[PDB]
Amino acid sequence: NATQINEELYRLLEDTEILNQEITEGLLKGFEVPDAGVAIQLSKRDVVYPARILIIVLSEMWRFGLTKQSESFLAQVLTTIQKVVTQLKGNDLIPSGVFWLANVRELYSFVVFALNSILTEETMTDEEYKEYVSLVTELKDDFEALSYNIYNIWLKKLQKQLQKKAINAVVISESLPGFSAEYTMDDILTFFNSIYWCMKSFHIENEVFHAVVTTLLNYVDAICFNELIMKRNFLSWKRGLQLNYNVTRLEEWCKTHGLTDGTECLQHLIQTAKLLQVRKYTIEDIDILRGICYSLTPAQLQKLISQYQVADYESPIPQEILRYVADIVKKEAALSSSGSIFITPETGPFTDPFSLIKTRKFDQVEAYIPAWLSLPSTKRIVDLVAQQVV
């Protein structure tokens, strides 16, 4: 009895109090991320289970012409997903963020699919039709905004977590303990490995990984560089070698995970490590140093060189070199009209990389809802939709 299926479907969708509470509190706030990482063979339906359920429910609302109730249901959904991402923190930050980007991307992708199909096919007034094209068009803009918003909320949280770890790991932690006599580089690699693996396991398009990682490495370069350039009894040949090792490990991680641009992201740190290690004896050494250190200004060069701490049995930086560098800075300043030492960290807002990319092609998928969930009305809707496939 399809009329008995449709009758039960219709009454389940009409009861917004129960259905909305189930969707918002159970499905969305109660989300569980599947285990990701190495040798983990996740199917898409394990990743995007909330989106796929919402897609089944939304479409059944539209099938029954509950167009205004879909609108209020979706308003709650959008609200809830954004709030959920806004509360993300701690060890779950990476997996849970990637999880939500995957799901919002799935939802946006469905809405674009729906809009195209509503515009392209003849199946009922043209005033009902007009308000329906209008609603879906508006839903597309709302999901585009949600995606932009959550990408940005999450990326900022990621930056904050790196602020906290990266400075100790890259700048202060000794790669050679005692050599010049708490987070380490391993924690930084773990962070970036988690981003790589979650994205891989949750089927995130590769352009997104590159955008996230490039934004983050550039941020690391800025904040760590800015801490280093302030240090006055710290910069030495030994610290240069240690920094080279810290930096190089990140640079080689980039190489192996496709990030050809990585070396370019880390240039201020790479070139600082160089400055701290190369000979600084002659005027020629300093002109060579400048070409090597193309990403550093004369004022930056001059701060680093002037704050360099010579070891016992190491030759001082000659005064002639110190004044040569000070007079390159004096010249560059004066060149601003011919005839900051800090790098500004990029805090966004950032372009949503999903927006630059074709949406996912919508193939119909079997009405599935995970067994571990406890959503009575939602599960009944899904079970009923699945019955009318037989």
Swiss-Prot record:
Belongs to the TRAFAC class myosin-kinesin ATPase superfamily. Myosin family. It comes from the Eukaryota. Residues 75-331 form the Dilute domain. Present with 4339 molecules/cell in log phase SD medium. Keywords: Acetylation, Actin-binding, ATP-binding, Calmodulin-binding, Cell cycle, Cell division, Coiled coil, Motor protein, Myosin, Nucleotide-binding, Phosphoprotein, Protein transport, Repeat, Transport. Myosin heavy chain that is required for the cell cycle-regulated transport of various organelles and proteins for their segregation. Functions by binding with its tail domain to receptor proteins on organelles and exerting force with its N-terminal motor domain against actin filaments, thereby transporting its cargo along polarized actin cables. Essential for the delivery of secretory vesicles to sites of active growth during bud emergence and cytokinesis. Changing residue 133 to G: In MYO2-573; causes a mitochondria inheritance defect. Changing residue 366 to G: In MYO2-573; causes a mitochondria inheritance defect. Changing residue 123 to M: Intragenic suppressor of MYO2-2. One of its GO terms (cellular component) is vesicle. The lineage of its organism: Eukaryota, Fungi, Dikarya, Ascomycota, Saccharomycotina. The myosin motor domain binds to actin. It is found in: Bud neck; Bud tip. One of its GO terms (molecular function) is microfilament motor activity. Changing residue 304 to S: In MYO2-338; abolishes interaction with YPT11. Its main location: other. This is Myosin-2. Changing residue 330 to M: In MYO2-573; causes a mitochondria inheritance defect. The keyword S-adenosyl-L-methionine does not apply. One of its GO terms (biological process) is actin filament organization. Changing residue 96 to G: Intragenic suppressor of MYO2-2. It comes from Saccharomyces cerevisiae (strain ATCC 204508 / S288c) (Baker's yeast). Residues 1-390 are annotated as: Non alpha-helical, tail domain.
